[PDB]
Amino acid sequence: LPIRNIPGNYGLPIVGPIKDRWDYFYDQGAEEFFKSRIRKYNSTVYRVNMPPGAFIAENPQVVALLDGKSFPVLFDVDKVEKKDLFTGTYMPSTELTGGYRILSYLDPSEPKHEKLKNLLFFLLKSSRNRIFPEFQATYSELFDSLEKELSLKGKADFGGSSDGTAFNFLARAFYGTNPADTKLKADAPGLITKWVLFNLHPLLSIGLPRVIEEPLIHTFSLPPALVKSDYQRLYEFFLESAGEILVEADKLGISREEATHNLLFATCFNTWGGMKILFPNMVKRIGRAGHQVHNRLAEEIRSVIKSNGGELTMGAIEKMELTKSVVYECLRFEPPVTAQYGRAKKDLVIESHDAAFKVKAGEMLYGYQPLATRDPKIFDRADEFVPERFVGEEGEKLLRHVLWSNGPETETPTVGNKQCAGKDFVVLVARLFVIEIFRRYDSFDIEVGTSPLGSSVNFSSLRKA
Numbered sequence: 001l002p003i004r005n006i007p008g009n010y011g012l013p014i015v016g017p018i019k020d021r022w023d024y025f026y027d028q029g030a031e032e033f034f035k036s037r038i039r040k041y042n043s044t045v046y047r048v049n050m051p052p053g054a055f056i057a058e059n060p061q062v063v064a065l066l067d068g069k070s071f072p073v074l075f076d077v078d079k080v081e082k083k084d085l086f087t088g089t090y091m092p093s094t095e096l097t098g099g100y101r102i103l104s105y106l107d108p109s110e111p112k113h114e115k116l117k118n119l120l121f122f123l124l125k126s127s128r129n130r131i132f133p134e135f136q137a138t139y140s141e142l143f144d145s146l147e148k149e150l151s152l153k154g155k156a157d158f159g160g161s162s163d164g165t166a167f168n169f170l171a172r173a174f175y176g177t178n179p180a181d182t183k184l185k186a187d188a189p190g191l192i193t194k195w196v197l198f199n200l201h202p203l204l205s206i207g208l209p210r211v212i213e214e215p216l217i218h219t220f221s222l223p224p225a226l227v228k229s230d231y232q233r234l235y236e237f238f239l240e241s242a243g244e245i246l247v248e249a250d251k252l253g254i255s256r257e258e259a260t261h262n263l264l265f266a267t268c269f270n271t272w273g274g275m276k277i278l279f280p281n282m283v284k285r286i287g288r289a290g291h292q293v294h295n296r297l298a299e300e301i302r303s304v305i306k307s308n309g310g311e312l313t314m315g316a317i318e319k320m321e322l323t324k325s326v327v328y329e330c331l332r333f334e335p336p337v338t339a340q341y342g343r344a345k346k347d348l349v350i351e352s353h354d355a356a357f358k359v360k361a362g363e364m365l366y367g368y369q370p371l372a373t374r375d376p377k378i379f380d381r382a383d384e385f386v387p388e389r390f391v392g393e394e395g396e397k398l399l400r401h402v403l404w405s406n407g408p409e410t411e412t413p414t415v416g417n418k419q420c421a422g423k424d425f426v427v428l429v430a431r432l433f434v435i436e437i438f439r440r441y442d443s444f445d446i447e448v449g450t451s452p453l454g455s456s457v458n459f460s461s462l463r464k465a
């Protein structure tokens with residue numbers, strides 16, 4: 001390929017980054033922010049300023065990688081450093097996380113990265129026999145509540161009940177603990193939401209006027225002191241509930257305190273936060289796919305479960321071709337976590353589709369994942385939600401281009417990489433979610449809005465089997 005100069009610029013000091021931030025949040029929105037510049041520069045690789053800049057991030061300057069050929073450099077731990085960039089060009093105060101740099105912020109070259117990631121692998125494996133029954137019990141109660149609410153109101157707010165369900169499910173599956181039996185009671189979703197906001201506010205908009213938002217959430221960090229007491233309630237829950245897991249932390253040579261802050265983070269931030277975005281998005285996209293698709297899913301799911309003597313098992317799920325494909329298509333079409341960063345460790349030559357580009361050691365690389373996973377040079381019908389996309393031998397080959405987990409779907413998270421520790425768990429619970437819906441309902445209708453993190457979604461009809 002021809003070597004091209006990386007197009008784009010960072011504009012004026014102070015003023016450049018602020019105007020780019022306004023485009024990003026207000027005047028364009030993330031997707032059009034990136035696409036308008038792809039068009040202008042005639043390039044899927046270019047220089048751009050990223051939020052938050054201001055007083056929160058020291059340096060907003062990045063090289064953006066916006067196609068599925070260039071983007072995977074962000075996975076290569078010999079090319080990029082992945083230290084302290086889980087949230088991008090700033091890092092939330094460690095006062096938010098017990099004074100520890102949590103696993104998500106650690107480069108694989110750090111010894112505690114290996115230890116802590118092994119801890120989470122153990123958490124997931126040891127939970128294996130609890131996931132099915134706890135999912136089916138907690139989500140059954142959720143759909144019961146949504147039916148109740150639909151009968152009362154003519155619509156049922158999915159997110160408003162599902163956030164509690166997801167936390168209860170995780171507490172029961174991971175720690176064999178019902179939060180209703182503890183001091184947390186039903187307060188966890190509110191506590192976690194505030195704490196996550198204190199971490200992520202510089203990257204988020206709530207729809208308030210920019211005159212209010214800019215000074216209040218985009219310029220300076222919210223003080224961690226204001227969420228410390230909330231965080232302490234969560235910590236005491238994890239400390240008291242995670243006994244069996246803490247035994248393994250002891251064996252791995254991790255302090256009880258460090259282990260507990262890490263379990264809190266993986267459970268509340270990575271898992272529950274991830275599910276908070278993913279599940280409503282799934283309900284939205286599957287809802288939009290239409291009743292013929294719903295009927296095909298119901299037919300497949302019910303037939304397979306019947307073939308399996310009414311027992312839902314991992315092997316039965318493997319028979320559910322359309323179900324597996326629809327889950328992968330949700331993750332392709334709308335990756336729940338869209339921003340991945342990496343700092344070049346050495347001089348690199350990054351190949352796009354039609355040119356190569358040279359980046360210097362120390363440059364911050366950034367990828368907006370939906371542009372890599374909806375890349376029309378990789379996927380046909382790239383901007384269409386295609387339920388059956390991954391069905392069959394040929395469809396399955398395309399999984400190497402599904403990147404939700406911060407690596408190819410065909411690859412395995414390891415202590416040597418920064419791929420999502422919960423990769424297999426997420427795909428499993430997403431499948432269980434679709435299964436639970438269509439074993440109960442023939443089809444459904446939705447009403448939808450936006451949310452700081454993804455979508456808000458109401459059911460307006462739930463057609464029982």
Ligand code: HEM
Nearest residue numbers: 103104120270271274275278336337406417418420421422
């Ligand atoms: C739908 C839910 C989830 C989504 C969308 C998601 C997505 C991601 C993404 C995109 C990253 C890469 C972060 C980066 O370096 O930019 C990541 C990392 C990580 N995730 Fe997940 N995740 C989810 C669930 C989980 C679960 C269930 C676990 C349970 C252990 C988990 C644990 C982690 C950990 C520990 C890392 C850092 C890995 C490392 O340091 O090597 N996540 N996740």
